[PDB]
C-alpha cells in the first residue's frame, strides 16, 4: 500500500493522540493528566509502592521528569516518598488511592467513546500486541 | 484488560507508548532522506494522487494547522520534491526511498508479530481514526 492511512505508525500516532486528548479532558476535575495519572497508577499497583527506576523504565521518562511528576503528587498528599530496607519507593496514600479510583472511572469512560463497538477480543488482541512492544521483557 | 488496575493494560497508555517508540525510530530512519515524519507524510499525500492534492485537507488528515503545512510543503518545494501540491519525478523517487526506510523501521518493532495480527490492528486503528 502507498496510502498514508495504511501507515501503522501514522495510525498509532493519530489514534493515540485522539485517545489521550479525550483522557486529558476527562481527567480535568481530578487535577491529573495522563502522565501524573499514570504515575499514580504505578504507585497504586503494590502496597509498598513503586520504584522510581521502575517508573522510568515503564514510561520512558527521564529522572528529572519523574521527580517533577512525583513532586506534584506528593504536594497533593496523594503519594509519599519511602525507603526500601536502598531503593527509592513511591507509595500511594489512601487519598491517592481514592483519586486513582475516581480517575480510572473517568479514563475508562473516555476510552469507551473510541472502543465501544469493537469486539472485546479484537481490542484485547491489540492490547496484547502493543504489550509485546512496550514491554518486550 | 477488563477490571485490571495495571498501567500495562491501559490501552491509551499502550497506544501512546508504542506510537512514541515507532515515531522515534521512523524519524531516525528518515535522517539520510532529509525528511521528518511530518514532511514525509505530506510527500506521501502528494504521491497518492497521480496529480495533485489540496492543502486544507492536509491539516485535517495530519491533525495540524495550515501554518505548519505551509512550512512543510515549502521545505519540500524548496528541494523540488513538490510543485505548488503535486510530486515531481524526484519527489516520487525520494518517496519510494523513504518508504523503504520507514518500512525497515516498522519492521524492527513488528517483525515476529504474525502479519494477520498486525494487519488486524491496522484495520481497527483505521476504524477509530477514520470512521
Ligand atoms: Mg496481554
PDB file of C-alpha atoms and ligand atoms in Angstrom:
ATOM      1  CA  UNK A   1       0.000   0.000   0.000  1.00  0.00           C
ATOM      2  CA  UNK A   2       1.090   3.548  -0.810  1.00  0.00           C
ATOM      3  CA  UNK A   3      -1.603   5.395   1.148  1.00  0.00           C
ATOM      4  CA  UNK A   4      -0.809   7.313   4.336  1.00  0.00           C
ATOM      5  CA  UNK A   5      -3.856   5.848   6.067  1.00  0.00           C
ATOM      6  CA  UNK A   6      -2.214   2.413   5.918  1.00  0.00           C
ATOM      7  CA  UNK A   7       0.933   3.642   7.673  1.00  0.00           C
ATOM      8  CA  UNK A   8       0.841   1.795  11.002  1.00  0.00           C
ATOM      9  CA  UNK A   9       2.969   4.473  12.677  1.00  0.00           C
ATOM     10  CA  UNK A  10       0.679   7.211  11.376  1.00  0.00           C
ATOM     11  CA  UNK A  11      -2.344   5.314  12.679  1.00  0.00           C
ATOM     12  CA  UNK A  12      -0.833   4.681  16.112  1.00  0.00           C
ATOM     13  CA  UNK A  13       0.083   8.356  16.467  1.00  0.00           C
ATOM     14  CA  UNK A  14      -3.298   9.593  15.203  1.00  0.00           C
ATOM     15  CA  UNK A  15      -5.361   7.241  17.393  1.00  0.00           C
ATOM     16  CA  UNK A  16      -3.040   7.693  20.375  1.00  0.00           C
ATOM     17  CA  UNK A  17      -3.411  11.466  20.128  1.00  0.00           C
ATOM     18  CA  UNK A  18      -7.199  11.275  19.957  1.00  0.00           C
ATOM     19  CA  UNK A  19      -7.476   8.966  22.947  1.00  0.00           C
ATOM     20  CA  UNK A  20      -5.006  10.866  25.140  1.00  0.00           C
ATOM     21  CA  UNK A  21      -6.707  14.142  24.238  1.00  0.00           C
ATOM     22  CA  UNK A  22     -10.041  12.727  25.373  1.00  0.00           C
ATOM     23  CA  UNK A  23      -8.467  11.299  28.534  1.00  0.00           C
ATOM     24  CA  UNK A  24      -6.782  14.571  29.496  1.00  0.00           C
ATOM     25  CA  UNK A  25     -10.112  16.361  29.015  1.00  0.00           C
ATOM     26  CA  UNK A  26     -11.970  13.776  31.128  1.00  0.00           C
ATOM     27  CA  UNK A  27      -9.297  13.979  33.847  1.00  0.00           C
ATOM     28  CA  UNK A  28      -9.661  17.742  34.345  1.00  0.00           C
ATOM     29  CA  UNK A  29     -11.736  17.550  37.565  1.00  0.00           C
ATOM     30  CA  UNK A  30      -9.123  15.247  39.139  1.00  0.00           C
ATOM     31  CA  UNK A  31      -6.319  17.783  38.708  1.00  0.00           C
ATOM     32  CA  UNK A  32      -4.443  14.969  36.982  1.00  0.00           C
ATOM     33  CA  UNK A  33      -3.157  14.455  33.458  1.00  0.00           C
ATOM     34  CA  UNK A  34      -2.206  11.264  31.615  1.00  0.00           C
ATOM     35  CA  UNK A  35       1.375  11.370  32.939  1.00  0.00           C
ATOM     36  CA  UNK A  36       0.655  12.184  36.590  1.00  0.00           C
ATOM     37  CA  UNK A  37      -2.286   9.757  36.494  1.00  0.00           C
ATOM     38  CA  UNK A  38      -0.024   7.014  35.122  1.00  0.00           C
ATOM     39  CA  UNK A  39       2.498   7.524  37.922  1.00  0.00           C
ATOM     40  CA  UNK A  40      -0.293   7.320  40.490  1.00  0.00           C
ATOM     41  CA  UNK A  41      -1.499   4.084  38.881  1.00  0.00           C
ATOM     42  CA  UNK A  42       2.003   2.617  39.086  1.00  0.00           C
ATOM     43  CA  UNK A  43       2.292   3.697  42.716  1.00  0.00           C
ATOM     44  CA  UNK A  44      -1.085   2.082  43.463  1.00  0.00           C
ATOM     45  CA  UNK A  45      -0.135  -1.275  41.914  1.00  0.00           C
ATOM     46  CA  UNK A  46       1.645  -2.532  45.032  1.00  0.00           C
ATOM     47  CA  UNK A  47       1.178  -1.651  48.696  1.00  0.00           C
ATOM     48  CA  UNK A  48       4.882  -0.902  49.161  1.00  0.00           C
ATOM     49  CA  UNK A  49       4.708   1.479  46.214  1.00  0.00           C
ATOM     50  CA  UNK A  50       6.729   1.662  43.026  1.00  0.00           C
ATOM     51  CA  UNK A  51      10.461   2.054  42.494  1.00  0.00           C
ATOM     52  CA  UNK A  52      11.377   5.325  40.753  1.00  0.00           C
ATOM     53  CA  UNK A  53      13.571   3.494  38.234  1.00  0.00           C
ATOM     54  CA  UNK A  54      10.650   1.181  37.554  1.00  0.00           C
ATOM     55  CA  UNK A  55       8.511   4.184  36.654  1.00  0.00           C
ATOM     56  CA  UNK A  56      11.225   5.463  34.318  1.00  0.00           C
ATOM     57  CA  UNK A  57      11.502   2.107  32.574  1.00  0.00           C
ATOM     58  CA  UNK A  58       7.742   1.640  32.194  1.00  0.00           C
ATOM     59  CA  UNK A  59       7.044   5.155  30.989  1.00  0.00           C
ATOM     60  CA  UNK A  60      10.257   6.109  29.196  1.00  0.00           C
ATOM     61  CA  UNK A  61      10.751   9.186  31.384  1.00  0.00           C
ATOM     62  CA  UNK A  62      13.989  10.849  32.472  1.00  0.00           C
ATOM     63  CA  UNK A  63      14.724  11.088  36.214  1.00  0.00           C
ATOM     64  CA  UNK A  64      14.043  14.837  36.202  1.00  0.00           C
ATOM     65  CA  UNK A  65      10.605  14.290  34.657  1.00  0.00           C
ATOM     66  CA  UNK A  66       9.684  11.574  37.161  1.00  0.00           C
ATOM     67  CA  UNK A  67      10.888  13.727  40.048  1.00  0.00           C
ATOM     68  CA  UNK A  68       8.629  16.522  38.828  1.00  0.00           C
ATOM     69  CA  UNK A  69       5.606  14.243  38.487  1.00  0.00           C
ATOM     70  CA  UNK A  70       6.141  12.695  41.912  1.00  0.00           C
ATOM     71  CA  UNK A  71       6.705  16.145  43.464  1.00  0.00           C
ATOM     72  CA  UNK A  72       3.306  17.204  42.151  1.00  0.00           C
ATOM     73  CA  UNK A  73       1.569  14.110  43.544  1.00  0.00           C
ATOM     74  CA  UNK A  74       3.321  14.368  46.914  1.00  0.00           C
ATOM     75  CA  UNK A  75       2.423  18.043  47.266  1.00  0.00           C
ATOM     76  CA  UNK A  76      -1.227  16.989  46.989  1.00  0.00           C
ATOM     77  CA  UNK A  77      -0.715  14.233  49.564  1.00  0.00           C
ATOM     78  CA  UNK A  78      -1.569  11.561  47.014  1.00  0.00           C
ATOM     79  CA  UNK A  79       1.822   9.935  47.280  1.00  0.00           C
ATOM     80  CA  UNK A  80       4.672   9.721  49.781  1.00  0.00           C
ATOM     81  CA  UNK A  81       8.360   9.010  49.221  1.00  0.00           C
ATOM     82  CA  UNK A  82       9.529   5.963  51.184  1.00  0.00           C
ATOM     83  CA  UNK A  83      12.710   3.906  51.553  1.00  0.00           C
ATOM     84  CA  UNK A  84      13.227   0.195  50.951  1.00  0.00           C
ATOM     85  CA  UNK A  85      15.102  -1.593  53.786  1.00  0.00           C
ATOM     86  CA  UNK A  86      18.320   1.306  49.232  1.00  0.00           C
ATOM     87  CA  UNK A  87      15.646   1.591  46.526  1.00  0.00           C
ATOM     88  CA  UNK A  88      13.607   4.797  46.236  1.00  0.00           C
ATOM     89  CA  UNK A  89       9.911   3.977  46.615  1.00  0.00           C
ATOM     90  CA  UNK A  90       6.803   5.968  45.737  1.00  0.00           C
ATOM     91  CA  UNK A  91       3.818   4.786  47.774  1.00  0.00           C
ATOM     92  CA  UNK A  92       0.220   5.892  47.253  1.00  0.00           C
ATOM     93  CA  UNK A  93      -1.678   7.363  50.207  1.00  0.00           C
ATOM     94  CA  UNK A  94      -5.272   6.436  50.931  1.00  0.00           C
ATOM     95  CA  UNK A  95      -6.314   9.646  49.313  1.00  0.00           C
ATOM     96  CA  UNK A  96      -4.179   8.870  46.302  1.00  0.00           C
ATOM     97  CA  UNK A  97      -5.908   5.554  46.069  1.00  0.00           C
ATOM     98  CA  UNK A  98      -9.315   7.235  46.217  1.00  0.00           C
ATOM     99  CA  UNK A  99      -8.313   9.694  43.493  1.00  0.00           C
ATOM    100  CA  UNK A 100      -6.847   6.906  41.380  1.00  0.00           C
ATOM    101  CA  UNK A 101     -10.176   5.067  41.667  1.00  0.00           C
ATOM    102  CA  UNK A 102     -12.078   8.199  40.647  1.00  0.00           C
ATOM    103  CA  UNK A 103      -9.689   8.917  37.754  1.00  0.00           C
ATOM    104  CA  UNK A 104      -9.836   5.360  36.394  1.00  0.00           C
ATOM    105  CA  UNK A 105     -13.623   5.651  36.105  1.00  0.00           C
ATOM    106  CA  UNK A 106     -13.164   8.797  34.025  1.00  0.00           C
ATOM    107  CA  UNK A 107     -10.386   7.274  31.922  1.00  0.00           C
ATOM    108  CA  UNK A 108     -12.470   4.166  31.187  1.00  0.00           C
ATOM    109  CA  UNK A 109     -15.431   6.313  30.151  1.00  0.00           C
ATOM    110  CA  UNK A 110     -13.105   8.224  27.810  1.00  0.00           C
ATOM    111  CA  UNK A 111     -11.749   5.018  26.273  1.00  0.00           C
ATOM    112  CA  UNK A 112     -15.346   3.856  25.841  1.00  0.00           C
ATOM    113  CA  UNK A 113     -16.047   6.609  23.323  1.00  0.00           C
ATOM    114  CA  UNK A 114     -13.451   5.148  20.970  1.00  0.00           C
ATOM    115  CA  UNK A 115     -13.592   1.411  21.732  1.00  0.00           C
ATOM    116  CA  UNK A 116     -17.227   0.562  22.434  1.00  0.00           C
ATOM    117  CA  UNK A 117     -18.465  -1.218  19.319  1.00  0.00           C
ATOM    118  CA  UNK A 118     -15.219  -3.070  18.756  1.00  0.00           C
ATOM    119  CA  UNK A 119     -15.401  -6.730  19.857  1.00  0.00           C
ATOM    120  CA  UNK A 120     -13.573  -7.133  23.176  1.00  0.00           C
ATOM    121  CA  UNK A 121     -11.409  -9.900  21.690  1.00  0.00           C
ATOM    122  CA  UNK A 122     -10.251  -7.574  18.904  1.00  0.00           C
ATOM    123  CA  UNK A 123      -9.389  -4.815  21.363  1.00  0.00           C
ATOM    124  CA  UNK A 124      -7.763  -7.422  23.627  1.00  0.00           C
ATOM    125  CA  UNK A 125      -5.559  -8.611  20.796  1.00  0.00           C
ATOM    126  CA  UNK A 126      -4.450  -5.074  20.040  1.00  0.00           C
ATOM    127  CA  UNK A 127      -3.585  -4.689  23.719  1.00  0.00           C
ATOM    128  CA  UNK A 128      -1.561  -7.870  23.550  1.00  0.00           C
ATOM    129  CA  UNK A 129       0.421  -6.830  20.516  1.00  0.00           C
ATOM    130  CA  UNK A 130       1.136  -3.360  21.935  1.00  0.00           C
ATOM    131  CA  UNK A 131       2.247  -5.071  25.141  1.00  0.00           C
ATOM    132  CA  UNK A 132       4.774  -7.178  23.308  1.00  0.00           C
ATOM    133  CA  UNK A 133       6.281  -3.941  22.019  1.00  0.00           C
ATOM    134  CA  UNK A 134       6.000  -1.602  25.034  1.00  0.00           C
ATOM    135  CA  UNK A 135       7.130  -4.358  27.419  1.00  0.00           C
ATOM    136  CA  UNK A 136       9.397  -6.670  25.402  1.00  0.00           C
ATOM    137  CA  UNK A 137      10.571  -8.080  28.720  1.00  0.00           C
TER     138      UNK A 137
ATOM    139  CA  UNK B   1      -7.563  -5.941  30.296  1.00  0.00           C
ATOM    140  CA  UNK B   2     -11.008  -5.984  31.944  1.00  0.00           C
ATOM    141  CA  UNK B   3     -11.137  -4.656  35.503  1.00  0.00           C
ATOM    142  CA  UNK B   4      -7.337  -4.636  35.672  1.00  0.00           C
ATOM    143  CA  UNK B   5      -5.594  -1.945  37.687  1.00  0.00           C
ATOM    144  CA  UNK B   6      -2.258  -2.297  35.886  1.00  0.00           C
ATOM    145  CA  UNK B   7      -0.926   0.508  33.694  1.00  0.00           C
ATOM    146  CA  UNK B   8       0.331  -2.215  31.348  1.00  0.00           C
ATOM    147  CA  UNK B   9      -3.315  -2.965  30.472  1.00  0.00           C
ATOM    148  CA  UNK B  10      -4.305   0.691  29.937  1.00  0.00           C
ATOM    149  CA  UNK B  11      -4.939   0.793  26.176  1.00  0.00           C
ATOM    150  CA  UNK B  12      -4.420   4.557  25.925  1.00  0.00           C
ATOM    151  CA  UNK B  13      -1.058   4.286  27.655  1.00  0.00           C
ATOM    152  CA  UNK B  14      -0.032   1.431  25.351  1.00  0.00           C
ATOM    153  CA  UNK B  15      -1.009   3.306  22.187  1.00  0.00           C
ATOM    154  CA  UNK B  16       0.956   6.405  23.151  1.00  0.00           C
ATOM    155  CA  UNK B  17       3.933   4.421  24.399  1.00  0.00           C
ATOM    156  CA  UNK B  18       4.208   2.303  21.231  1.00  0.00           C
ATOM    157  CA  UNK B  19       3.301   5.231  18.997  1.00  0.00           C
ATOM    158  CA  UNK B  20       6.122   7.271  20.520  1.00  0.00           C
ATOM    159  CA  UNK B  21       8.640   4.459  20.103  1.00  0.00           C
ATOM    160  CA  UNK B  22       7.746   3.919  16.444  1.00  0.00           C
ATOM    161  CA  UNK B  23       7.757   7.641  15.666  1.00  0.00           C
ATOM    162  CA  UNK B  24      11.211   7.953  17.224  1.00  0.00           C
ATOM    163  CA  UNK B  25      12.564   5.065  15.175  1.00  0.00           C
ATOM    164  CA  UNK B  26      10.996   6.276  11.934  1.00  0.00           C
ATOM    165  CA  UNK B  27      12.499   9.743  12.400  1.00  0.00           C
ATOM    166  CA  UNK B  28      15.950   8.209  12.825  1.00  0.00           C
ATOM    167  CA  UNK B  29      15.393   6.113   9.701  1.00  0.00           C
ATOM    168  CA  UNK B  30      14.415   9.204   7.695  1.00  0.00           C
ATOM    169  CA  UNK B  31      17.562  11.167   8.589  1.00  0.00           C
ATOM    170  CA  UNK B  32      19.544  10.382   5.412  1.00  0.00           C
ATOM    171  CA  UNK B  33      16.398  11.152   3.457  1.00  0.00           C
ATOM    172  CA  UNK B  34      16.278  14.721   4.766  1.00  0.00           C
ATOM    173  CA  UNK B  35      12.642  14.310   5.795  1.00  0.00           C
ATOM    174  CA  UNK B  36      10.906  14.032   9.155  1.00  0.00           C
ATOM    175  CA  UNK B  37       7.729  12.041   9.757  1.00  0.00           C
ATOM    176  CA  UNK B  38       5.599  15.139   9.143  1.00  0.00           C
ATOM    177  CA  UNK B  39       7.215  16.254   5.882  1.00  0.00           C
ATOM    178  CA  UNK B  40       7.333  12.648   4.690  1.00  0.00           C
ATOM    179  CA  UNK B  41       3.614  12.448   5.376  1.00  0.00           C
ATOM    180  CA  UNK B  42       2.931  15.407   3.105  1.00  0.00           C
ATOM    181  CA  UNK B  43       5.093  13.918   0.353  1.00  0.00           C
ATOM    182  CA  UNK B  44       3.117  10.670   0.654  1.00  0.00           C
ATOM    183  CA  UNK B  45      -0.202  12.500   0.351  1.00  0.00           C
ATOM    184  CA  UNK B  46       1.078  14.159  -2.823  1.00  0.00           C
ATOM    185  CA  UNK B  47       2.195  10.894  -4.418  1.00  0.00           C
ATOM    186  CA  UNK B  48      -1.163   9.275  -3.614  1.00  0.00           C
ATOM    187  CA  UNK B  49      -2.947  11.087  -6.429  1.00  0.00           C
ATOM    188  CA  UNK B  50      -1.051  10.772  -9.712  1.00  0.00           C
ATOM    189  CA  UNK B  51      -1.552  14.525  -9.972  1.00  0.00           C
ATOM    190  CA  UNK B  52      -2.484  16.837  -7.115  1.00  0.00           C
ATOM    191  CA  UNK B  53      -3.602  17.162  -3.501  1.00  0.00           C
ATOM    192  CA  UNK B  54      -5.213  20.068  -1.623  1.00  0.00           C
ATOM    193  CA  UNK B  55      -3.827  21.985   1.359  1.00  0.00           C
ATOM    194  CA  UNK B  56      -6.677  22.390   3.850  1.00  0.00           C
ATOM    195  CA  UNK B  57      -7.271  18.641   3.606  1.00  0.00           C
ATOM    196  CA  UNK B  58      -3.761  18.028   4.901  1.00  0.00           C
ATOM    197  CA  UNK B  59      -4.234  19.848   8.206  1.00  0.00           C
ATOM    198  CA  UNK B  60      -7.297  17.679   8.769  1.00  0.00           C
ATOM    199  CA  UNK B  61      -5.616  14.385   7.896  1.00  0.00           C
ATOM    200  CA  UNK B  62      -2.424  15.174   9.827  1.00  0.00           C
ATOM    201  CA  UNK B  63      -4.213  16.890  12.690  1.00  0.00           C
ATOM    202  CA  UNK B  64      -2.140  20.038  12.240  1.00  0.00           C
ATOM    203  CA  UNK B  65      -2.714  23.597  11.004  1.00  0.00           C
ATOM    204  CA  UNK B  66      -2.157  25.372   7.636  1.00  0.00           C
ATOM    205  CA  UNK B  67       0.824  27.307   9.025  1.00  0.00           C
ATOM    206  CA  UNK B  68       2.683  24.063   9.713  1.00  0.00           C
ATOM    207  CA  UNK B  69       1.633  22.672   6.331  1.00  0.00           C
ATOM    208  CA  UNK B  70       2.890  25.763   4.514  1.00  0.00           C
ATOM    209  CA  UNK B  71       6.284  25.324   6.145  1.00  0.00           C
ATOM    210  CA  UNK B  72       6.201  21.603   5.393  1.00  0.00           C
ATOM    211  CA  UNK B  73       5.324  21.982   1.706  1.00  0.00           C
ATOM    212  CA  UNK B  74       7.840  24.830   1.478  1.00  0.00           C
ATOM    213  CA  UNK B  75      10.546  22.515   2.807  1.00  0.00           C
ATOM    214  CA  UNK B  76       9.569  20.036   0.093  1.00  0.00           C
ATOM    215  CA  UNK B  77       9.139  22.530  -2.749  1.00  0.00           C
ATOM    216  CA  UNK B  78      12.448  24.138  -1.796  1.00  0.00           C
ATOM    217  CA  UNK B  79      14.054  20.809  -2.705  1.00  0.00           C
ATOM    218  CA  UNK B  80      11.889  20.390  -5.796  1.00  0.00           C
ATOM    219  CA  UNK B  81      10.115  17.398  -4.289  1.00  0.00           C
ATOM    220  CA  UNK B  82       6.742  19.002  -4.949  1.00  0.00           C
ATOM    221  CA  UNK B  83       5.391  21.745  -7.216  1.00  0.00           C
ATOM    222  CA  UNK B  84       2.732  24.024  -5.735  1.00  0.00           C
ATOM    223  CA  UNK B  85       0.648  20.232  -4.446  1.00  0.00           C
ATOM    224  CA  UNK B  86       1.928  17.619  -6.896  1.00  0.00           C
ATOM    225  CA  UNK B  87       5.052  15.477  -6.607  1.00  0.00           C
ATOM    226  CA  UNK B  88       7.973  15.686  -9.022  1.00  0.00           C
ATOM    227  CA  UNK B  89       9.882  12.882 -10.623  1.00  0.00           C
ATOM    228  CA  UNK B  90      12.255  13.476  -7.771  1.00  0.00           C
ATOM    229  CA  UNK B  91       9.715  13.582  -5.047  1.00  0.00           C
ATOM    230  CA  UNK B  92       8.373  10.290  -6.230  1.00  0.00           C
ATOM    231  CA  UNK B  93      11.873   8.797  -6.175  1.00  0.00           C
ATOM    232  CA  UNK B  94      12.522  10.112  -2.671  1.00  0.00           C
ATOM    233  CA  UNK B  95       9.101   8.931  -1.518  1.00  0.00           C
ATOM    234  CA  UNK B  96       9.899   5.365  -2.579  1.00  0.00           C
ATOM    235  CA  UNK B  97      13.292   5.612  -0.881  1.00  0.00           C
ATOM    236  CA  UNK B  98      11.858   6.989   2.352  1.00  0.00           C
ATOM    237  CA  UNK B  99       9.195   4.272   2.220  1.00  0.00           C
ATOM    238  CA  UNK B 100      11.805   1.505   2.236  1.00  0.00           C
ATOM    239  CA  UNK B 101      13.389   3.218   5.224  1.00  0.00           C
ATOM    240  CA  UNK B 102      10.098   3.708   7.083  1.00  0.00           C
ATOM    241  CA  UNK B 103       9.180   0.074   6.422  1.00  0.00           C
ATOM    242  CA  UNK B 104      12.539  -1.104   7.742  1.00  0.00           C
ATOM    243  CA  UNK B 105      11.914   0.894  10.909  1.00  0.00           C
ATOM    244  CA  UNK B 106       8.408  -0.529  11.396  1.00  0.00           C
ATOM    245  CA  UNK B 107       9.893  -3.990  10.912  1.00  0.00           C
ATOM    246  CA  UNK B 108      12.222  -3.599  13.879  1.00  0.00           C
ATOM    247  CA  UNK B 109       9.109  -3.389  16.049  1.00  0.00           C
ATOM    248  CA  UNK B 110       6.590  -5.598  14.260  1.00  0.00           C
ATOM    249  CA  UNK B 111       8.753  -8.393  12.845  1.00  0.00           C
ATOM    250  CA  UNK B 112       7.948 -11.521  14.845  1.00  0.00           C
ATOM    251  CA  UNK B 113       4.334 -10.495  15.349  1.00  0.00           C
ATOM    252  CA  UNK B 114       2.182 -12.524  12.942  1.00  0.00           C
ATOM    253  CA  UNK B 115       1.054 -10.493   9.927  1.00  0.00           C
ATOM    254  CA  UNK B 116      -2.650 -11.237  10.394  1.00  0.00           C
ATOM    255  CA  UNK B 117      -2.392  -9.786  13.893  1.00  0.00           C
ATOM    256  CA  UNK B 118      -0.627  -6.610  12.741  1.00  0.00           C
ATOM    257  CA  UNK B 119      -2.941  -6.290   9.734  1.00  0.00           C
ATOM    258  CA  UNK B 120      -5.936  -6.531  12.037  1.00  0.00           C
ATOM    259  CA  UNK B 121      -4.603  -3.832  14.338  1.00  0.00           C
ATOM    260  CA  UNK B 122      -4.215  -1.565  11.321  1.00  0.00           C
ATOM    261  CA  UNK B 123      -7.863  -2.266  10.481  1.00  0.00           C
ATOM    262  CA  UNK B 124      -9.085  -1.396  13.971  1.00  0.00           C
ATOM    263  CA  UNK B 125      -6.921   1.727  14.210  1.00  0.00           C
ATOM    264  CA  UNK B 126      -8.372   2.819  10.868  1.00  0.00           C
ATOM    265  CA  UNK B 127     -11.950   2.370  12.074  1.00  0.00           C
ATOM    266  CA  UNK B 128     -11.176   4.658  15.008  1.00  0.00           C
ATOM    267  CA  UNK B 129      -9.094   7.284  13.198  1.00  0.00           C
ATOM    268  CA  UNK B 130     -11.372   7.437  10.160  1.00  0.00           C
ATOM    269  CA  UNK B 131     -14.919   6.266  10.994  1.00  0.00           C
TER     270      UNK B 131
HETATM  271 MG1  LIG C   1      -1.755  -9.379  27.340  1.00  0.00          MG
END
